[PDB]
Design a protein around this ligand. Structure first.
Ligand SMILES: Cc1cc2nc3c(=O)[nH]c(=O)nc-3n(C[C@H](O)[C@H](O)[C@H](O)COP(=O)(O)OP(=O)(O)OC[C@H]3O[C@@H](n4cnc5c(N)ncnc54)[C@H](O)[C@@H]3O)c2cc1C
Ligand SMILES: Cc1cc2nc3c(=O)[nH]c(=O)nc-3n(C[C@H](O)[C@H](O)[C@H](O)COP(=O)(O)OP(=O)(O)OC[C@H]3O[C@@H](n4cnc5c(N)ncnc54)[C@H](O)[C@@H]3O)c2cc1C
Ligand SMILES: NC(=O)c1ccc[n+]([C@@H]2O[C@H](COP(=O)([O-])OP(=O)(O)OC[C@H]3O[C@@H](n4cnc5c(N)ncnc54)[C@H](OP(=O)(O)O)[C@@H]3O)[C@@H](O)[C@H]2O)c1
Ligand SMILES: NC(=O)c1ccc[n+]([C@@H]2O[C@H](COP(=O)([O-])OP(=O)(O)OC[C@H]3O[C@@H](n4cnc5c(N)ncnc54)[C@H](OP(=O)(O)O)[C@@H]3O)[C@@H](O)[C@H]2O)c1
Lengths: 303, 303
């Protein structure tokens, strides 16, 4: 009944959907939230070819805008499962089922947790995984950012608009982030570093975070220091719960594809951050999206 | 001496260069012409995620703009050859040589010729491979467009601004172009079709084209019809002459990479339209560009 259903309306799904619709495939784009995916949780995007800088939520709106006119059917849906019925597939959401010849899974990734004490307890009250979402609640605080990658370092630089200071705690003595971003953080007077360290406990009073205990990974030295907020950027986990059963994921839960975005299962493709891969960017999300869309057309043409 | 040299400043090279520069790699971007590559020969781009429509040359300027500020060294160069010296490589242009640890080849593709009589003879005087370049010279003419793909059908639709009529001659009875573009051409009153046909001869007077002879591929029927211009869109050939010797191309001349944009030769990558692949789009150019850029960084880090 659908030629293709695309699950998730971040940049990978939005690209796939634009391409399927332009092939005049009967296209459903399901999204549980706001179109844009992780881009809506991004302050400034500097490395999307075509824009010198752009706010994440504006890029999300720009990518979503043409879809309706192209004939993509945009619908609300949280997908809970997928069933392969050979020559068609069924997609189950909270309330609905959809039948389709092909599926492109574009559900992205989610913040990894530290799995330390206080992390759950201070959820709404000093612990955050989204700087653009939460930053302004921390005006004039001493903010802590955990991690050493692109997100941690970029989001620390963003947070310097709000905090008195921002400290980046990284578990080694060399960041992973792109060098241009490292150098910006090195130079920024309001960014401090706690190198070779990991957080052990987040502590607070009845109602908000007050301090963080941490440990040096070369010496075991343990320090407790006062902070007003903690933003955690320690990597990603796959958002692929609805395919756990299907035999298309690796040991960590990422969806395995070949170079044409195909899974094991004919007519089920995956694109973007949800895939097993190393390089998670908007550029490669878009690329993947386009490739899967062409592969889905071909698959359905053959069917 | 360079960490990376990127050869060609279309969207694949421009993306690669942006990414290498952001990794603080000493980056040279050589281009023989104008930044933008095939995008400068494109009228309206509707399917680049982030823009609902944009003129090709404007998208080219937008993609080129940040490069200087990021520290990419933009230089004129026509590359004539590359020599692999194990732990470095040499790149030869008309007048220069450049030594580099890594290379990303992003030189794209060029219009395939019909290799028919009159095609060379009427080069500047009715025969064209670029509608945005030449279209306005054909105001009020009966224009012919040869081919059945995305370029032929899109460029025919563009040319209807100028010609009295535009006729698309395709060698089968079904176009290859994206269905949205086919349907637009079907509906457009100024587009005619010559199905199941190929051009055999382009004829003219001393000074300009006047007519085209063609043949039906199912019946052999031969017809001669008057036209004022002919635009040819019969596919692509690789732009890879400078690596013919190196063992990295297929029988047609396309550069063979794996999924991480690597050729045979360590530290030589290829991206975008020049690669052996099926799906040549700006989206996948950009994706390839980004992937190669991350692979080059890693390669050079290791070296
Ligand atoms: C803070 C931060 C800054 C970043 N900055 C940049 C940058 O500057 N440049 C860059 O290139 N990359 C950047 N990235 C990476 C970039 O945002 C991602 O690579 C890209 O968004 C991934 O796109 P995607 O479409 O694969 O996944 P996503 O954007 O993750 O979208 C997945 C979508 O699927 C939906 N979804 C999930 N599960 C379901 C379900 N079960 N049913 C329905 N819908 C579901 C989600 O709601 C989401 O909208 C950044 C990431 C972060 C966190
Ligand atoms: C008429 C037309 C319309 C199109 N419309 C669209 C569209 O709407 N959407 C879309 O997604 N795709 C479209 N495309 C496809 C898109 O333009 C290409 O996929 C994309 O430009 C390829 O980028 P690239 O960087 O790999 O190659 P290119 O853009 O081909 O750039 C290659 C560059 O390398 C340079 N170069 C070549 N040889 C050398 C040398 N020896 N030394 C130095 N420099 C050299 C060239 O000057 C060029 O600037 C269109 C193509 C055409 C022809
Ligand atoms: N501008 C952009 O292009 C952009 C922006 C944001 C994100 N992204 C991409 O999105 C993906 C996710 O990036 P990310 O930064 O979110 O994740 P990431 O690359 O996995 O980096 C996580 C960082 O946190 C460190 N870390 C992990 N556990 C830690 C702990 N317990 N204590 C302290 N530090 C810890 C990691 O250490 P190690 O380095 O030791 O592993 C790593 O440096 C990446 O591929 C990234 O490039 C891109
Ligand atoms: N909007 C966009 O995304 C966009 C726009 C332009 C181009 N592109 C991409 O750029 C690449 C190049 O596209 P293209 O259209 O330039 O090339 P293409 O896809 O190779 O199509 C060439 C067309 O001409 C036909 N043909 C070949 N020889 C012919 C002859 N002698 N007489 C009449 N017709 C003939 C082919 O026939 P058969 O079909 O029988 O082979 C084909 O339909 C493609 O991957 C394309 O999708 C994309």
């Amino acid at each position: 009944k659908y030629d293709v259903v695309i699950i998730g309306s971040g940049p990978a799904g939005m690209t796939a959907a634009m391409y399927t619709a332009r092939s005049e495939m009967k296209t459903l784009l399901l999204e549980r939230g706001v179109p844009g995916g992780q881009m809506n949780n991004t302050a400034e995007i500097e490395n999307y070819p075509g824009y010198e800088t752009i706010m994440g939520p504006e890029l999300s709106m720009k990518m979503a805008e043409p879809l309706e006119g192209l004939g993509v059917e945009n619908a609300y849906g949280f997908v809970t499962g997928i069933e392969d019925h050979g020559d068609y597939k069924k997609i189950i959401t909270e309330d609905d089922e959809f039948i389709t010849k092909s599926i492109i899974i574009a559900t992205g990734a989610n913040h990894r947790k530290l799995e330390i004490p206080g992390e759950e307890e201070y959820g709404a009250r000093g612990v955050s995984y989204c700087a653009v979402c939460d930053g302004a609640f921390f005006r004039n605080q001493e903010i802590l950012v955990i991690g050493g990658g692109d997100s941690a370092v970029e989001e620390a630089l963003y947070l310097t608009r709000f905090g008195q200071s921002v400290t980046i705690m990284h578990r080694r003595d060399k960041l992973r982030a792109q060098e241009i971003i490292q150098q910006r953080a090195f130079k920024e007077e309001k960014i401090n570093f706690i190198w070779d360290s990991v957080p052990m406990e987040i502590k607070g009073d009845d109602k908000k975070i007050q301090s963080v205990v941490y440990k040096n990974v070369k010496t075991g030295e343990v320090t407790e220091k006062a902070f007003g907020g903690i933003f955690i950027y320690v990597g990603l986990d796959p958002v692929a719960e609805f395919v756990s059963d299907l035999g298309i994921t690796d040991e960590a839960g990422w969806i395995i594809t070949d170079d044409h975005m195909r899974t094991n299962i004919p007519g089920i493709f995956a694109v973007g951050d949800v895939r097993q891969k190393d390089f998670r960017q908007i550029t490669t999300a878009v690329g993947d999206g386009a490739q899967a869309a062409q592969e889905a057309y071909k698959f359905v043409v053959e069917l």
